[PDB]
Swiss-Prot record, chain B:
Disulfide bonds: none annotated. Keywords: 4Fe-4S, Chlorophyll, Chloroplast, Chromophore, Electron transport, Iron, Iron-sulfur, Magnesium, Membrane, Metal-binding, Oxidoreductase, Photosynthesis, Photosystem I, Plastid, Thylakoid, Transmembrane, Transmembrane helix, Transport. One of its GO terms (cellular component) is chloroplast thylakoid membrane. Chlorophyll a binds at M675, Y683. PsaA and PsaB bind P700, the primary electron donor of photosystem I (PSI), as well as the electron acceptors A0, A1 and FX. PSI is a plastocyanin-ferredoxin oxidoreductase, converting photonic excitation into a charge separation, which transfers an electron from the donor P700 chlorophyll pair to the spectroscopically characterized acceptors A0, A1, FX, FA and FB in turn. Oxidized P700 is reduced on the lumenal side of the thylakoid membrane by plastocyanin. Chlorophyll a' binds at H667. The chain crosses the membrane at residues 62-85, 148-171, 187-211, 283-301, 338-361, 377-403, 425-447, 523-541, 581-602, 656-678, 716-736. It comes from the Eukaryota. It catalyses: reduced [plastocyanin] + hnu + oxidized [2Fe-2S]-[ferredoxin] = oxidized [plastocyanin] + reduced [2Fe-2S]-[ferredoxin]. This is Photosystem I P700 chlorophyll a apoprotein A1. It comes from Physcomitrium patens (Spreading-leaved earth moss). The PsaA/B heterodimer binds the P700 chlorophyll special pair and subsequent electron acceptors. PSI consists of a core antenna complex that captures photons, and an electron transfer chain that converts photonic excitation into a charge separation. The eukaryotic PSI reaction center is composed of at least 11 subunits. The gene is psaA. Belongs to the PsaA/PsaB family. The lineage of its organism: Eukaryota, Viridiplantae, Streptophyta, Embryophyta, Bryophyta.
From Swiss-Prot, chain C:
It comes from Physcomitrium patens. This is Photosystem I iron-sulfur center. Apoprotein for the two 4Fe-4S centers FA and FB of photosystem I (PSI); essential for photochemical activity. FB is the terminal electron acceptor of PSI, donating electrons to ferredoxin. The C-terminus interacts with PsaA/B/D and helps assemble the protein into the PSI complex. Required for binding of PsaD and PsaE to PSI. PSI is a plastocyanin-ferredoxin oxidoreductase, converting photonic excitation into a charge separation, which transfers an electron from the donor P700 chlorophyll pair to the spectroscopically characterized acceptors A0, A1, FX, FA and FB in turn. GO terms for cellular component: chloroplast thylakoid membrane; photosystem I. Binds 2 [4Fe-4S] clusters. Cluster 2 is most probably the spectroscopically characterized electron acceptor FA and cluster 1 is most probably FB. Its cofactor is [4Fe-4S] cluster. NCBIfam families: PS_I_psaC. It is found in: Plastid, Chloroplast thylakoid membrane.
UniProtKB/Swiss-Prot annotation, chain F:
This is Photosystem I P700 chlorophyll a apoprotein A2. It is found in: Plastid, Chloroplast thylakoid membrane. The chain holds residues 369 to 441 of 734 of the full protein. PsaA and PsaB bind P700, the primary electron donor of photosystem I (PSI), as well as the electron acceptors A0, A1 and FX. PSI is a plastocyanin-ferredoxin oxidoreductase, converting photonic excitation into a charge separation, which transfers an electron from the donor P700 chlorophyll pair to the spectroscopically characterized acceptors A0, A1, FX, FA and FB in turn. Oxidized P700 is reduced on the lumenal side of the thylakoid membrane by plastocyanin. Belongs to the PsaA/PsaB family. The chain crosses the membrane at residues 1-27, 49-71. The PsaA/B heterodimer binds the P700 chlorophyll special pair and subsequent electron acceptors. PSI consists of a core antenna complex that captures photons, and an electron transfer chain that converts photonic excitation into a charge separation. The eukaryotic PSI reaction center is composed of at least 11 subunits.
Length: 159, 742, 80, 141, 62, 73, 73, 73
């Protein structure tokens, strides 16, 4: 459809990309007995290959003129499962990491030896902050609105 | 005089010094103000002579660290044996060592990496190893996975034992300085006890278990029907069936009539015609002789029993006209300084590793070793690299000694002083000979390249045009070829098949060894080897000699062994310490060893290896194109790099895929090294400020201020990444080539 | 021939003159910091550019500054 | 103070070296250092090697000034020995340098003039873009 | 100048601690001192020192 | 091919020289008193933000390009 | 083509990052807040203060030439 | 060679090369006017960059011309 790519469950080049690999695996397989560890491993590999090729066609990815999936990172509603759906969860996880790290730094900074608490972590406080870091957007936006997110008296100097 | 000396419980074992990360040095025990604390912590984590000043604690720490290292080596060995026992096709290999590729590592199927478990043969699937452990176990007489399991456990035990000792002799019973200084008894016990008795024990094992089992393996019997290694110990008749000399009991050895032991104590050159390896009946005799040699050599030095030499009267007695006051004051150097000993030990051990790498390829000591080309190439390259590293380490530690252990108030003993007093001559002449060698070695290649480019090959330096046949090497080859007839009447054959004498030996197809020719293409590369070695010696010796002072900086010893530079003055004084000379010599060592291993690889694939067919016709791998195509740099570019690099690049989708991946990975690491090797600290330290600004803007400023790497750590990182990338690239290339085509 | 300068922030640590390996910097009476001491560079014709002086002054930025100028035989550190 | 005058005092015992004087010493300046010792010790030469200084007076000629200052600092620190050194021209014109007024440059001294002292903070010099086509650099002011 | 133990913020344009805070230690009250105020900071500079002296007109924010 | 390669390398060298001479201007020709609070002064006023964001863009691009290439490898 | 265009963007971004950092911190930085008095090209400012090798703006240009050549390659 | 190794090694090498030239017969009749010294720091960086750039340009011009004109597409 879009970008001149056909869906993968109709691509006549995907069939070859499957059957050639299957036949290679079977050529490897025919060097043992059907009741030996190499044969079991190879049959498992073949079943995994079939299960993989019978999922891309059902998902809705568009293959190319060479029989290979192509990702439409465009915003297309028929393809949200390629970029934006995993991208949102990644952004969630990364904001989580950053927010809990920032909060740990903020809390440690007001102590006796803050430099000591950075080579020797204090696991109770760090764990508390990691736990509380689940609702980080509702906290980051709240700190932005309340004017608590940024400083103004930065210590940069240039003569 | 010589006695046991121990201080009961000098250090209480606890966890207090364990919780404070920096504890050994007081300068950084306080805490990490900036982030250049995490770095120098690990930097001087092992600088035992820098933390404290008394030789006693330094010696105790050295002892316990040696014990820890031995424990780690024991864990490594037990792991290798356990893998050979549990995940190896060893028993299948034993039934057909010429069609089964060794393999002792399997990979879990997780993300498609299952294809690394290639079809090695025998109903097994795993990565094909090249350590040569299968050949070693076959030569040892090991014939069952059980006999591996046990020894694995054995290793583990020793590991724990070592660890125990390592703790004990530092925390419960640690010696005192006066005990370590007894070098006479130490050498006595390392000569007679460690080397002599060790060689005697291994000769015993050989002559009792390794000879009959391997002989029955050569007679073509099943490795399962061979009696167990103790049926030849509790049955002298079952062992005498092969070597009937055992029927004569232990009487020939005691009546000096032991010329009747010629069955299992032989003197025969060449290789076993069916295994392509040395005769174990010869190595048993060799070990038996080496053992008594080291034993009678372990009685030279004086202990508290009246007799023996003292290595101070021996030294002072050698004092000639030309050389001032002789070797006086050197016994005081090698017993009150751990570095002046480490230098000599590292130099000798590196040179010995090079000798080993040169001997093993020419006289294969394990059965079916010369046949497996991959193992014989890896065992050369690895050992060469190890020796090349150890010699540079020796240079570095000699420089360290000269920097902070030498003192003149006692070194008026004009041997070290005299060589220190004409450094401006030593280095000048070494520089001149380096220039001469570089020209007369590389300019010849440039001549050949220009001629072959100008359509005039008749003016080249080939074997058809102007010739440069090495006559001395050819004469040595012809002399050793005739030794078993004139200069060695009892040896049945020459020591090696690489000498011009002898003939070819086959191991069922592929060839093992044959007489190696030497033409102009070998003359040129040998002179190139000499030139690179000379340049490395130049750099290292210049550093060592000028470690104390020079015309530029007369007080360099006050600055120390490791420091970036003495200002941008005097025109510039960057990279002026001995550490920087070691930094510069590492690259030339890398260059030299890479040229050596390229030489060996191409020459072996071209003029030694191959697969012979019936009627005698032997076709080498490349086709003998080394004598003609190795005289021009273009030949090394296409006929060696471009041609032989055609296996690794197209290894995708095969069992050799990891080599194709690590090719590009090592290329990336090598190119990554250039960022550190070319840049400098100021630019990065400035750039970091503009990131700390963005951090402060959002209140994420760390308390450990992010300083950039020091001027010396940048160089260290650069050379480390450079060496890793280069060696890993050559590793991947060599293995992916030889595994497929060998 | 390099140009040394001593700005009026020297607290009289005397380290600059202790570090300079050419007898270039010397102490001088100058009231104003704590001890009426200050540095002085009368023999700048001998400075090689070692910058050991600047690596010693524990001032905010610096109080003794070396500016590399015209090169000569003395400043190049030559012995031949 | 009247600068000390050179003499023909003896020289320390030394078997030679390849890090000594060069042609620079006969067509240009060269330096010579003296000191006084109470016994006969072994001291490290700033040119490589060791030498035994003699009791009483000693005189040593070197090739640079930094060599003399290095040796003198080592003396004053390890042996507690005071010293001076001069610079000699091709035409034999001795010039007295190091203890120019007797007191070493560390201890304060009266009758010393300030040279190269600026009456401002280092971060106050004018930009190098106003003093263009005018050879005043930034700091000689 | 300022009081002892007072938290002041620097204004020296060529200072490592520019726009940073520090507590005074002891200001010298001699007649001819050009930089009497002594302030110690809780973060070392590139050289490693944390104490420095300024003039009273060169740093004040309270 | 020769024409394209030639002109692109010339363009690279020229684009590097433009920034080199901008730096020389800033060093030896810029007067902070005449250029009081114009745009050229406010470029120096907030240069840390510019360098930080260029750093972020380059890091992001390199991380992700190398990651995708190695994944396909 | 996507991946190569992104590699080109990365190259451009890193090159302009180096050149802009140089041109901006050519008048002075926190490590050396008098760089305007020393000129365009000077080797370093000594080993002190942690190490100030390769600090001038000419060195920024010298570092950026490599990235320019790499991008054009 | 000019980017990895720095000056303090080469100057300490030249200082003994000059000795070797001075202390030999039959060759001290000749004499240099300009005292031989090692290349400066920024000069070394410049020569290194020039070599790097000339090599980078030449080994790719040769390749792009030979691989194409040898086949003509
Ligand atoms: C039984 C447990 C035990 C305990 C509680 C201690 C306690 C102590 N030891 Mg001790 N030691 C032990 C066992 C123990 N030791 C053993 C078995 C050995 C023999 C190797 C030693 C050898 C030894 C020496 C030589 C020294 C100490 C020292 C010390 C004191 C400080 C140690 C410290 O903070 O460094 C903690 C260090 C570590 C946690 C590093 C451990 C790294 C291990 C040893 C090697 C692991 C290598 C491994 C294979 C990784 C390789 C690379 C990998 C990344 C691939 C402290 C009282 C030091 C001392 O008192 O000096 C003032 C000292 O100099 N010990
Ligand atoms: C230097 C020594 C060394 C090295 C490099 C390895 C390395 C390895 N071992 Mg191993 N091993 C060692 C010593 C070593 N071992 C010793 C001493 C023992 C005996 C206790 C074992 C017993 C052992 C077992 C039982 C297994 C491994 C396995 C493995 C592999 C996976 C390990 C993992 O992911 O966790 C890995 C290649 C695993 C493996 O290869 O799975 C197929 C596995 O099952 N090892
Ligand atoms: C190069 C070999 C070499 C040389 C030249 C010597 C030379 C010597 N050894 Mg000697 N030795 C050697 C190897 C050698 N040894 C070895 C390999 C061992 C073992 C010994 C064990 C040995 C003992 C045990 C003694 C000597 C002694 C002597 C001295 C008296 C012997 C004599 O002249 O009659 C003499 C200086 C004797 C002596 O007093 O020497 C000081 C003595 O008691 N040697
Ligand atoms: C018998 C062997 C031996 C021994 C006992 C020592 C012992 C010592 N060396 Mg030494 N050295 C050796 C061999 C040896 N060296 C060799 C062969 C070389 C030549 C390369 C050197 C070069 C050398 C230098 C240049 C210096 C020393 C220094 C030292 C001292 C401090 C070491 C330290 O704290 O390191 C701590 C250890 C580390 C920081 C580990 C660094 C990590 C390495 C570089 C990378 C390893 C790569 C690994 C194989 C694989 C990489 C991939 C993987 C990591 C993912 C110590 C006395 C230093 C000193 O000042 O001496 C007083 C010093 O400056 N050595
Ligand atoms: C391919 C790059 C390369 C080359 C050619 C060299 C070359 C050299 N290095 Mg070297 N070096 C390099 C990379 C390189 N280095 C790198 C990357 C490092 C960093 C680790 C070093 C580190 C290093 C050190 C630490 C040392 C050297 C030394 C030397 C010299 C050894 C003397 C010699 O063999 O002269 C032979 C010279 C050649 C073969 C060059 C080619 C000459 C051609 C064939 C002749 C041309 C004919 C004619 C003159 C042309 C006229 C042209 C005209 C008509 C226009 C030599 C000049 C050593 C030294 O100074 O010893 C004297 C030394 O101590 N280098
Ligand atoms: C229209 C083209 C052009 C012109 C007229 C100039 C002119 C100039 N350049 Mg320049 N330059 C150019 C292109 C140009 N450049 C390009 C394309 C680059 C990038 C490779 C450079 C990189 C460059 C540097 C790095 C330096 C100069 C310098 C100079 C000045 C002195 C040149 C010298 O010492 O010899 C001079 C005003 C130098 C200068 O002004 O020093 C203060 C200097 O250091 N240029
Ligand atoms: C294959 C080699 C290699 C690799 C992987 C890198 C990787 C990097 N360099 Mg780099 N660099 C290299 C060689 C390399 N360099 C060489 C040879 C030089 C010449 C000395 C430089 C000069 C250089 C500069 C001057 C800068 C980088 C920067 C960067 C970073 C850019 C961000 C990114 O892409 O992620 C990154 C870590 C930039 C950086 O720090 O990013 C913020 C930066 O400013 N590099
Ligand atoms: C080779 C020369 C050789 O035979 O050495 C012999 C000679 C050693 O003679 P002596 O009898 O002085 O030395 C014996 C003992 O004194 C210890 O060397 O060595 C030298 O003269 C120094 C060698 C420099 C060699 C220059 C090259
Ligand atoms: C799309 C389109 C369009 C548009 C386009 C455009 C609009 C473009 C733009 C473009 C651009 C927008 C470009 C730009 C460029 C830039 C650059 C190239 C820059 C550079 C710069 C520099 C080089 C700087 C320097 C300096 C300094 C640093 C300082 C001093 C000053 C100076 C300036 C010298 C049109 C409609 C037409 C058509 C259609 C489509
Ligand atoms: C890049 C570079 C730097 C700067 C590079 C630095 C500071 C490397 C530091 C990067 C590491 C990866 C930071 C450590 C990250 C922490 C371990 C965080 C751990 C948590 C996860 C990220 C794993 C120099 O300081 C330098 C100095 C002299 C010559 C060349 C160079 C040089 O090339
Ligand atoms: C080799 C080397 C030297 C020594 C090299 C010397 C003295 C250069 C002289 C080489 C010969 C004498 C000239 C070569 C001639 C060229 C082919 C062209 C000359 C220039 C043209 C304008 C003619 C350094 O001084 C140095 C300094 C800092 C970092 C690295 C290095 C460095 O690598
Ligand atoms: S390295 Fe450090 S010291 Fe040596 S020159 Fe470059 S900057 Fe000056």
């Amino acid at each position: 459809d879009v970008a001149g790519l056909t869906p993968c469950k109709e691509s006549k080049g995907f069939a070859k990309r499957e059957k050639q690999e299957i036949k290679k695996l079977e050529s490897r397989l025919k060097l043992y007995a059907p009741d030996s560890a190499p044969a079991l491993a190879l049959n498992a590999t073949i079943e995994k290959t079939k299960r993989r090729f019978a999922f891309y066609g059902n998902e809705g990815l568009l293959c190319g003129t060479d029989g290979l999936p192509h990702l439409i990172v465009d915003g297309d509603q028929a393809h949200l499962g390629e970029f934006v759906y995993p991208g949102l969860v990644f952004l969630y996880i990364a904001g989580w990491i950053g927010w809990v790290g920032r909060a740990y730094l903020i809390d440690v900074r007001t102590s006796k030896k803050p430099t000591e608490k950075e080579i020797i972590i204090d696991v109770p406080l760090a764990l508390r902050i990691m736990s509380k870091g689940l609702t980080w957007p509702v906290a980051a936006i709240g700190e932005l609105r309340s004017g608590k997110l940024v400083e103004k008296s930065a210590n940069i100097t240039v003569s | 005089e010589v006695k046991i000396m121990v201080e009961k419980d000098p250090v209480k074992t606890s966890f207090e010094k364990w919780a404070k990360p920096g504890h050994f040095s007081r300068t950084l025990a306080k805490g990490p103000n900036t982030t250049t604390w995490i770095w120098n912590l690990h930097a001087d984590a092992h600088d035992f002579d820098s933390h404290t000043n008394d030789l006693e604690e330094i010696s105790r720490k050295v002892f316990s660290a040696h014990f820890g290292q031995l424990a780690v080596i024991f864990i490594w060995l037990s792991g290798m044996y356990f893998h050979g026992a549990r995940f190896s096709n060893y028993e299948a290999w034993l039934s057909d060592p010429t069609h089964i590729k060794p393999s002792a590592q399997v990979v879990w199927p997780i993300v498609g990496q299952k294809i690394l478990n290639g079809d090695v043969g025998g109903g097994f699937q795993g990565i094909q190893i090249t350590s040569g452990f299968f050949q070693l176990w076959r030569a040892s007489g090991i014939t069952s996975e059980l006999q591996l399991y046990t020894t694995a456990i054995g290793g583990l035990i020793f590991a724990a034992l070592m660890l125990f000792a390592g703790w004990f002799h530092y925390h419960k019973a640690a010696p005192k300085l006066a005990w370590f200084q007894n070098v006479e008894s130490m050498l006595n016990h390392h000569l007679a006890g460690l080397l002599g008795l060790g060689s005697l024990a291994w000769a015993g094992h050989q002559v009792h278990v390794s000879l009959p089992i391997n002989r029955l393996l050569d007679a073509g019997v099943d490795p399962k029907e061979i009696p167990l290694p103790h049926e030849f110990i509790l049955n002298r008749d079952l062992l005498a069936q092969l070597y009937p000399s055992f029927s004569k009991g232990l009487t020939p050895f005691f009546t000096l009539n032991w010329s009747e032991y010629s069955d299992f104590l032989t003197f025969r050159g060449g290789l076993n015609p069916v295994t392509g390896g040395l005769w174990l009946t010869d190595t048993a005799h060799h070990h038996l002789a080496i053992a008594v040699l080291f034993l009678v050599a372990g009685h030279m030095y004086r202990t508290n029993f009246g007799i023996g030499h003292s290595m101070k009267e021996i030294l002072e007695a050698h004092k000639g006209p030309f050389t001032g006051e002789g070797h006086k004051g050197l016994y005081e150097i090698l017993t009150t300084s751990w570095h002046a000993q480490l230098a000599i030990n590292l130099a000798m051990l590196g040179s010995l590793t090079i000798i080993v790498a040169h001997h093993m390829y020419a006289m294969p000591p394990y059965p079916y070793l010369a046949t497996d080309y991959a193992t014989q190439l890896s065992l050369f390259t690895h050992h060469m690299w190890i020796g090349g590293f150890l010699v540079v380490g020796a240079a570095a530690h000699a420089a360290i000694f000269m920097v902070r252990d030498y003192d003149p108030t006692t070194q008026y003993n004009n041997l070290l002083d005299r060589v220190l007093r004409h450094r401006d001559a030593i280095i000048s002449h070494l520089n001149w000979v380096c220039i001469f060698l570089g020209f007369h070695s590389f300019g010849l290649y440039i001549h050949n390249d220009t001629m072959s480019a100008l359509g005039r090959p008749q003016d080249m330096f080939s074997d058809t045009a102007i010739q440069l046949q090495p006559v001395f090497a050819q004469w040595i080859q012809n002399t050793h070829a005739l030794a078993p007839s004139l200069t060695a009447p009892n040896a049945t054959a020459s020591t090696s098949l690489t000498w011009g004498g002898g003939d070819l030996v086959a191991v069922g197809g592929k060839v093992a060894l044959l007489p190696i020719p030497l033409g102009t293409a070998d003359f040129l590369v040998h002179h190139i080897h000499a030139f690179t070695i000379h340049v490395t010696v130049l750099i290292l010796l210049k550093g060592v000699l000028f470690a104390r002072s020079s015309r530029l900086i007369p007080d360099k010893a006050n600055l120390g062994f490791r420091f970036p530079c003495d200002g941008p003055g005097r025109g510039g004084t960057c990279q002026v310490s001995a550490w920087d000379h070691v930094f510069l010599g590492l690259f030339w060592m890398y260059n030299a060893i890479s040229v050596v291993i390229f030489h060996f690889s191409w020459k072996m694939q071209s003029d030694v290896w191959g697969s012979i067919s019936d009627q005698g016709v032997v076709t080498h791998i490349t086709g003998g194109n080394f004598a003609q195509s190795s005289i021009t740099i273009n030949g090394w570019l296409r006929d060696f790099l471009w041609a032989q690099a055609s296996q690794v690049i197209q290894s995708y989708g095969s069992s050799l895929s990891a080599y194709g991946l690590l090719f590009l990975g090592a290329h990336f690491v090598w190119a990554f090294s250039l960022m550190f090797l070319f840049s400098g600290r100021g630019y990065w330290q400035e750039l970091i400020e503009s990131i700390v600004w963005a951090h402060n803007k959002l209140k994420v400023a760390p308390a450990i201020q992010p300083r950039a790497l020091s001027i010396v750590q940048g160089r260290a990182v650069g050379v480390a990444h450079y060496l890793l990338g280069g060696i890993a690239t050559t590793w991947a290339f060599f293995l992916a080539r030889i595994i497929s085509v060998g | 021939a390099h140009s040394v300068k001593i700005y009026d922030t020297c607290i009289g640590c005397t380290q600059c003159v202790r570090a300079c390996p050419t007898d270039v910097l010397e102490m001088v009476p100058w009231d104003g910091c704590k001890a009426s001491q200050i540095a002085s560079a009368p023999r700048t014709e001998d400075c090689v550019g070692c910058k050991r002086c600047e690596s010693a002054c524990p001032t905010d930025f610096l109080s003794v500054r070396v500016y590399l100028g015209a090169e000569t035989t003395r400043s190049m550190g030559l012995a031949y | 103070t009247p600068p000390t005058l050179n003499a023909d005092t003896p020289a320390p015992i030394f078997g030679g070296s390849t890090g000594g004087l060069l042609r620079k010493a006969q067509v240009e300046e060269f330096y010579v250092i003296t000191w006084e010792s109470p016994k006969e010790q072994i001291f490290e030469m700033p040119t490589g090697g060791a030498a035994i200084m003699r009791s009483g007076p000693n005189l040593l000629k070197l090739a640079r000034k930094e060599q003399c200052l290095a040796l003198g600092a080592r003396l004053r620190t390890k042996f507690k020995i005071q010293y001076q050194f001069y610079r000699v021209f091709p035409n034999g014109e001795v010039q007295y340098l190091h203890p120019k007024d007797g007191v070493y440059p560390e201890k304060v001294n009266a009758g010393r003039s300030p040279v190269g002292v600026n009456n401002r903070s280092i971060g106050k010099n004018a930009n190098p873009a106003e003093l263009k086509f005018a050879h005043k650099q930034a700091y000689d002011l | 100048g300022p009081k002892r133990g007072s938290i002041v913020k620097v204004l020296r344009r060529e200072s490592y601690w520019f726009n940073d805070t520090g507590k005074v230690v002891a200001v010298d009250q001699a007649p001819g001192v050009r930089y009497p105020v002594v302030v110690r900071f809780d973060k070392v500079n590139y050289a490693g020192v944390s104490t420095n002296n300024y003039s009273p007109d060169e740093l004040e924010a309270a | 091919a020769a024409l394209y390669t030639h002109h692109q390398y010339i363009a690279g060298f020229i684009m590097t020289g433009a920034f080199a001479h901008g730096a020389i201007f800033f060093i030896r020709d810029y007067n902070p008193e005449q250029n009081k609070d114009n745009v050229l002064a406010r470029m120096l006023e907030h240069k840390e933000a510019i360098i930080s964001h260029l750093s972020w863009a380059s890091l992001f691009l390199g991380f992700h390009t190398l990651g995708l290439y190695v994944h396909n490898d | 083509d996507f991946l190569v265009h992104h590699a080109i963007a990365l190259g451009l971004h890193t090159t302009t990052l180096i050149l802009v950092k140089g041109a901006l911190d050519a008048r002075g930085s926190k490590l050396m807040p008098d760089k305007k008095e020393f000129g365009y090209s000077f080797p370093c400012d000594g080993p002190g203060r942690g190490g100030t090798c390769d600090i001038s703006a000419w060195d920024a240009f010298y570092l950026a030439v490599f990235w320019m050549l790499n991008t054009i390659g | 060679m000019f980017l990895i190794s720095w000056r303090g090694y080469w100057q300490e090498l030249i200082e003994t090369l000059a000795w070797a030239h001075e202390r030999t017969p039959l060759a001290n009749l000749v004499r240099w006017k300009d005292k031989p010294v090692a290349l400066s720091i920024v000069q070394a960086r410049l020569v290194g960059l020039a070599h790097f750039s000339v090599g980078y340009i030449f080994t790719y011009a040769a390749f792009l011309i030979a691989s194409t004109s040898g086949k003509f597409g």
